[PDB]
mmCIF file of N, CA and C in Angstrom:
data_model
loop_
_atom_site.group_PDB
_atom_site.id
_atom_site.type_symbol
_atom_site.label_atom_id
_atom_site.label_comp_id
_atom_site.label_asym_id
_atom_site.label_seq_id
_atom_site.Cartn_x
_atom_site.Cartn_y
_atom_site.Cartn_z
ATOM 1 N N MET C 1 1.139 -10.708 -6.953
ATOM 2 C CA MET C 1 2.585 -10.735 -7.098
ATOM 3 C C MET C 1 3.257 -9.705 -6.219
ATOM 4 N N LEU C 2 4.459 -10.038 -5.780
ATOM 5 C CA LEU C 2 5.284 -9.100 -5.053
ATOM 6 C C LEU C 2 6.465 -8.866 -5.977
ATOM 7 N N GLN C 3 6.919 -7.621 -6.075
ATOM 8 C CA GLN C 3 8.094 -7.317 -6.881
ATOM 9 C C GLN C 3 9.298 -7.292 -5.955
ATOM 10 N N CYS C 4 10.390 -7.902 -6.392
ATOM 11 C CA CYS C 4 11.630 -7.892 -5.624
ATOM 12 C C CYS C 4 12.791 -7.666 -6.579
ATOM 13 N N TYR C 5 13.894 -7.165 -6.043
ATOM 14 C CA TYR C 5 15.143 -7.176 -6.787
ATOM 15 C C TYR C 5 15.591 -8.633 -6.758
ATOM 16 N N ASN C 6 15.868 -9.205 -7.922
ATOM 17 C CA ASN C 6 16.259 -10.608 -7.966
ATOM 18 C C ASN C 6 17.329 -10.847 -9.017
ATOM 19 N N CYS C 7 18.479 -11.345 -8.566
ATOM 20 C CA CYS C 7 19.598 -11.670 -9.446
ATOM 21 C C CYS C 7 20.029 -13.108 -9.125
ATOM 22 N N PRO C 8 20.202 -13.939 -10.150
ATOM 23 C CA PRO C 8 20.511 -15.349 -9.913
ATOM 24 C C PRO C 8 21.862 -15.576 -9.238
ATOM 25 N N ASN C 9 22.791 -14.646 -9.435
ATOM 26 C CA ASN C 9 24.102 -14.714 -8.793
ATOM 27 C C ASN C 9 24.338 -13.456 -7.956
ATOM 28 N N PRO C 10 25.132 -13.571 -6.892
ATOM 29 C CA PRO C 10 25.419 -12.411 -6.050
ATOM 30 C C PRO C 10 26.111 -11.321 -6.860
ATOM 31 N N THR C 11 25.853 -10.070 -6.494
ATOM 32 C CA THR C 11 26.429 -8.929 -7.197
ATOM 33 C C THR C 11 26.275 -7.664 -6.356
ATOM 34 N N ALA C 12 27.162 -6.697 -6.570
ATOM 35 C CA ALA C 12 27.195 -5.487 -5.755
ATOM 36 C C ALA C 12 25.942 -4.612 -5.829
ATOM 37 N N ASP C 13 25.339 -4.515 -7.007
ATOM 38 C CA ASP C 13 24.196 -3.628 -7.175
ATOM 39 C C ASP C 13 23.128 -4.233 -8.073
ATOM 40 N N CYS C 14 22.386 -5.185 -7.521
ATOM 41 C CA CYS C 14 21.299 -5.820 -8.244
ATOM 42 C C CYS C 14 20.104 -4.876 -8.297
ATOM 43 N N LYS C 15 19.785 -4.379 -9.486
ATOM 44 C CA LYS C 15 18.608 -3.533 -9.636
ATOM 45 C C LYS C 15 17.643 -4.126 -10.647
ATOM 46 N N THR C 16 17.745 -5.437 -10.826
ATOM 47 C CA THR C 16 16.850 -6.162 -11.713
ATOM 48 C C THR C 16 15.540 -6.423 -10.989
ATOM 49 N N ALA C 17 14.515 -5.658 -11.339
ATOM 50 C CA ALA C 17 13.202 -5.835 -10.731
ATOM 51 C C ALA C 17 12.476 -7.006 -11.380
ATOM 52 N N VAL C 18 12.016 -7.940 -10.554
ATOM 53 C CA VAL C 18 11.266 -9.078 -11.051
ATOM 54 C C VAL C 18 9.912 -9.156 -10.390
ATOM 55 N N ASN C 19 8.962 -9.656 -11.158
ATOM 56 C CA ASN C 19 7.639 -9.937 -10.669
ATOM 57 C C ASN C 19 7.686 -11.381 -10.148
ATOM 58 N N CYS C 20 7.811 -11.564 -8.833
ATOM 59 C CA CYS C 20 7.998 -12.914 -8.285
ATOM 60 C C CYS C 20 6.818 -13.839 -8.567
ATOM 61 N N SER C 21 7.103 -15.124 -8.753
ATOM 62 C CA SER C 21 6.036 -16.101 -8.946
ATOM 63 C C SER C 21 5.232 -16.217 -7.655
ATOM 64 N N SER C 22 4.049 -16.820 -7.740
ATOM 65 C CA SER C 22 3.131 -16.857 -6.605
ATOM 66 C C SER C 22 3.591 -17.684 -5.405
ATOM 67 N N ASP C 23 4.604 -18.520 -5.602
ATOM 68 C CA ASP C 23 5.143 -19.320 -4.503
ATOM 69 C C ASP C 23 6.019 -18.476 -3.580
ATOM 70 N N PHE C 24 6.357 -17.270 -4.027
ATOM 71 C CA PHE C 24 7.183 -16.362 -3.237
ATOM 72 C C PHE C 24 6.319 -15.298 -2.567
ATOM 73 N N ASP C 25 6.482 -15.137 -1.258
ATOM 74 C CA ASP C 25 5.698 -14.153 -0.523
ATOM 75 C C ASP C 25 6.553 -13.093 0.162
ATOM 76 N N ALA C 26 7.845 -13.079 -0.149
ATOM 77 C CA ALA C 26 8.758 -12.125 0.467
ATOM 78 C C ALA C 26 9.939 -11.816 -0.441
ATOM 79 N N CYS C 27 10.662 -10.752 -0.107
ATOM 80 C CA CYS C 27 11.901 -10.405 -0.791
ATOM 81 C C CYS C 27 13.015 -10.604 0.226
ATOM 82 N N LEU C 28 14.194 -10.987 -0.245
ATOM 83 C CA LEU C 28 15.333 -11.202 0.646
ATOM 84 C C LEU C 28 16.540 -10.399 0.177
ATOM 85 N N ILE C 29 17.250 -9.782 1.117
ATOM 86 C CA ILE C 29 18.559 -9.214 0.825
ATOM 87 C C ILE C 29 19.521 -9.705 1.899
ATOM 88 N N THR C 30 20.631 -10.289 1.461
ATOM 89 C CA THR C 30 21.605 -10.867 2.381
ATOM 90 C C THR C 30 22.992 -10.330 2.094
ATOM 91 N N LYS C 31 23.712 -9.985 3.152
ATOM 92 C CA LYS C 31 25.106 -9.593 3.030
ATOM 93 C C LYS C 31 25.950 -10.681 3.691
ATOM 94 N N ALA C 32 26.666 -11.433 2.860
ATOM 95 C CA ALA C 32 27.469 -12.559 3.327
ATOM 96 C C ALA C 32 28.921 -12.286 2.971
ATOM 97 N N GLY C 33 29.682 -11.816 3.951
ATOM 98 C CA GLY C 33 31.051 -11.392 3.701
ATOM 99 C C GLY C 33 31.014 -10.176 2.783
ATOM 100 N N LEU C 34 31.698 -10.275 1.649
ATOM 101 C CA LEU C 34 31.758 -9.181 0.685
ATOM 102 C C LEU C 34 30.684 -9.301 -0.396
ATOM 103 N N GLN C 35 29.924 -10.390 -0.365
ATOM 104 C CA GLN C 35 28.900 -10.626 -1.374
ATOM 105 C C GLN C 35 27.520 -10.154 -0.929
ATOM 106 N N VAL C 36 26.675 -9.831 -1.902
ATOM 107 C CA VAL C 36 25.310 -9.410 -1.620
ATOM 108 C C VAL C 36 24.345 -10.214 -2.477
ATOM 109 N N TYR C 37 23.288 -10.715 -1.853
ATOM 110 C CA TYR C 37 22.278 -11.478 -2.565
ATOM 111 C C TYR C 37 20.947 -10.741 -2.484
ATOM 112 N N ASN C 38 20.194 -10.776 -3.578
ATOM 113 C CA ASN C 38 18.856 -10.193 -3.625
ATOM 114 C C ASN C 38 17.965 -11.188 -4.352
ATOM 115 N N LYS C 39 16.937 -11.680 -3.664
ATOM 116 C CA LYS C 39 16.108 -12.755 -4.205
ATOM 117 C C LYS C 39 14.631 -12.631 -3.864
ATOM 118 N N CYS C 40 13.798 -13.199 -4.732
ATOM 119 C CA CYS C 40 12.419 -13.515 -4.391
ATOM 120 C C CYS C 40 12.584 -14.640 -3.374
ATOM 121 N N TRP C 41 11.812 -14.606 -2.297
ATOM 122 C CA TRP C 41 12.017 -15.548 -1.203
ATOM 123 C C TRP C 41 10.692 -15.955 -0.570
ATOM 124 N N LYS C 42 10.779 -16.819 0.437
ATOM 125 C CA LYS C 42 9.603 -17.273 1.165
ATOM 126 C C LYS C 42 9.789 -16.962 2.639
ATOM 127 N N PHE C 43 8.766 -16.376 3.247
ATOM 128 C CA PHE C 43 8.829 -16.018 4.655
ATOM 129 C C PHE C 43 9.240 -17.195 5.542
ATOM 130 N N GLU C 44 8.758 -18.389 5.208
ATOM 131 C CA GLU C 44 9.103 -19.595 5.959
ATOM 132 C C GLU C 44 10.610 -19.861 5.976
ATOM 133 N N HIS C 45 11.333 -19.260 5.034
ATOM 134 C CA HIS C 45 12.773 -19.482 4.928
ATOM 135 C C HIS C 45 13.590 -18.285 5.392
ATOM 136 N N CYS C 46 12.940 -17.367 6.097
ATOM 137 C CA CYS C 46 13.628 -16.196 6.622
ATOM 138 C C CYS C 46 14.207 -16.481 8.000
ATOM 139 N N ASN C 47 15.242 -17.313 8.008
ATOM 140 C CA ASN C 47 15.950 -17.696 9.224
ATOM 141 C C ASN C 47 17.350 -18.150 8.802
ATOM 142 N N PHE C 48 18.289 -18.160 9.743
ATOM 143 C CA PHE C 48 19.673 -18.491 9.425
ATOM 144 C C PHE C 48 19.831 -19.865 8.774
ATOM 145 N N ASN C 49 19.117 -20.860 9.286
ATOM 146 C CA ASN C 49 19.265 -22.211 8.757
ATOM 147 C C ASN C 49 18.960 -22.267 7.263
ATOM 148 N N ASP C 50 17.827 -21.697 6.871
ATOM 149 C CA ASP C 50 17.400 -21.764 5.477
ATOM 150 C C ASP C 50 18.181 -20.843 4.541
ATOM 151 N N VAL C 51 18.591 -19.680 5.041
ATOM 152 C CA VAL C 51 19.377 -18.750 4.236
ATOM 153 C C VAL C 51 20.796 -19.259 3.990
ATOM 154 N N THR C 52 21.483 -19.654 5.058
ATOM 155 C CA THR C 52 22.854 -20.147 4.930
ATOM 156 C C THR C 52 22.927 -21.393 4.049
ATOM 157 N N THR C 53 22.045 -22.354 4.300
ATOM 158 C CA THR C 53 22.068 -23.604 3.551
ATOM 159 C C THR C 53 21.743 -23.434 2.071
ATOM 160 N N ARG C 54 20.775 -22.577 1.759
ATOM 161 C CA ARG C 54 20.365 -22.388 0.369
ATOM 162 C C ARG C 54 21.369 -21.583 -0.452
ATOM 163 N N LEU C 55 22.009 -20.609 0.188
ATOM 164 C CA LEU C 55 23.022 -19.799 -0.473
ATOM 165 C C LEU C 55 24.413 -20.409 -0.330
ATOM 166 N N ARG C 56 24.521 -21.434 0.510
ATOM 167 C CA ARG C 56 25.809 -22.044 0.818
ATOM 168 C C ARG C 56 26.789 -20.994 1.338
ATOM 169 N N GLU C 57 26.299 -20.179 2.266
ATOM 170 C CA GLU C 57 27.108 -19.159 2.911
ATOM 171 C C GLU C 57 27.075 -19.431 4.408
ATOM 172 N N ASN C 58 28.126 -19.029 5.105
ATOM 173 C CA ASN C 58 28.226 -19.304 6.529
ATOM 174 C C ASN C 58 27.903 -18.057 7.351
ATOM 175 N N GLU C 59 28.835 -17.113 7.390
ATOM 176 C CA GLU C 59 28.600 -15.858 8.098
ATOM 177 C C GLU C 59 27.781 -14.929 7.217
ATOM 178 N N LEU C 60 26.693 -14.398 7.767
ATOM 179 C CA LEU C 60 25.850 -13.478 7.012
ATOM 180 C C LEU C 60 24.840 -12.771 7.901
ATOM 181 N N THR C 61 24.240 -11.719 7.354
ATOM 182 C CA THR C 61 23.078 -11.077 7.954
ATOM 183 C C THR C 61 22.024 -11.023 6.857
ATOM 184 N N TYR C 62 20.758 -11.130 7.236
ATOM 185 C CA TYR C 62 19.692 -11.136 6.245
ATOM 186 C C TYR C 62 18.541 -10.221 6.637
ATOM 187 N N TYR C 63 17.755 -9.832 5.642
ATOM 188 C CA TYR C 63 16.605 -8.967 5.852
ATOM 189 C C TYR C 63 15.507 -9.410 4.903
ATOM 190 N N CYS C 64 14.343 -9.715 5.462
ATOM 191 C CA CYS C 64 13.197 -10.142 4.676
ATOM 192 C C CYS C 64 12.091 -9.105 4.829
ATOM 193 N N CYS C 65 11.322 -8.905 3.766
ATOM 194 C CA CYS C 65 10.239 -7.927 3.780
ATOM 195 C C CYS C 65 9.189 -8.314 2.734
ATOM 196 N N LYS C 66 8.044 -7.635 2.743
ATOM 197 C CA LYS C 66 6.961 -7.999 1.834
ATOM 198 C C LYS C 66 6.335 -6.841 1.064
ATOM 199 N N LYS C 67 7.125 -5.799 0.827
ATOM 200 C CA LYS C 67 6.684 -4.654 0.037
ATOM 201 C C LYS C 67 7.527 -4.583 -1.237
ATOM 202 N N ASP C 68 6.911 -4.167 -2.340
ATOM 203 C CA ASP C 68 7.598 -4.109 -3.629
ATOM 204 C C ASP C 68 8.981 -3.461 -3.540
ATOM 205 N N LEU C 69 9.981 -4.147 -4.090
ATOM 206 C CA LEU C 69 11.353 -3.640 -4.154
ATOM 207 C C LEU C 69 11.913 -3.223 -2.796
ATOM 208 N N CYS C 70 11.450 -3.889 -1.743
ATOM 209 C CA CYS C 70 11.878 -3.582 -0.383
ATOM 210 C C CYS C 70 13.261 -4.138 -0.030
ATOM 211 N N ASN C 71 13.766 -5.066 -0.843
ATOM 212 C CA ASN C 71 15.053 -5.707 -0.565
ATOM 213 C C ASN C 71 16.252 -4.969 -1.137
ATOM 214 N N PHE C 72 16.315 -3.660 -0.892
ATOM 215 C CA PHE C 72 17.469 -2.866 -1.311
ATOM 216 C C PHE C 72 18.591 -3.034 -0.285
ATOM 217 N N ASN C 73 19.834 -2.909 -0.745
ATOM 218 C CA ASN C 73 21.007 -3.248 0.065
ATOM 219 C C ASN C 73 21.133 -2.447 1.358
ATOM 220 N N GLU C 74 20.699 -1.193 1.315
ATOM 221 C CA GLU C 74 20.799 -0.313 2.468
ATOM 222 C C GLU C 74 19.895 -0.724 3.633
ATOM 223 N N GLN C 75 19.121 -1.791 3.446
ATOM 224 C CA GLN C 75 18.311 -2.328 4.536
ATOM 225 C C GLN C 75 19.228 -2.940 5.591
ATOM 226 N N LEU C 76 20.442 -3.288 5.169
ATOM 227 C CA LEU C 76 21.453 -3.860 6.065
ATOM 228 C C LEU C 76 22.722 -3.006 6.171
ATOM 229 N N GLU C 77 23.394 -3.087 7.335
ATOM 230 C CA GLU C 77 24.521 -2.174 7.630
ATOM 231 C C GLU C 77 25.831 -2.717 7.068
ATOM 232 N N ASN C 78 26.946 -2.004 7.150
ATOM 233 C CA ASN C 78 28.168 -2.648 6.642
ATOM 234 C C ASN C 78 28.928 -3.339 7.728
#
């Protein structure tokens, strides 16, 4: 298992640590406008097409990693 911060809805400070299911091999943190997403994710989906479409967001920056709780917000700039 990989541990990630994971919140089902976007929020300013997601600190809910989850033990991701085995289908997830990465953590994701995305800043889309004023919203922030933190999710258990899949490396295969660490690209603009898969992030934008799944979150239904247009403009965004994303950061994927594979270390426990690595998807903290400060991984991305303002």
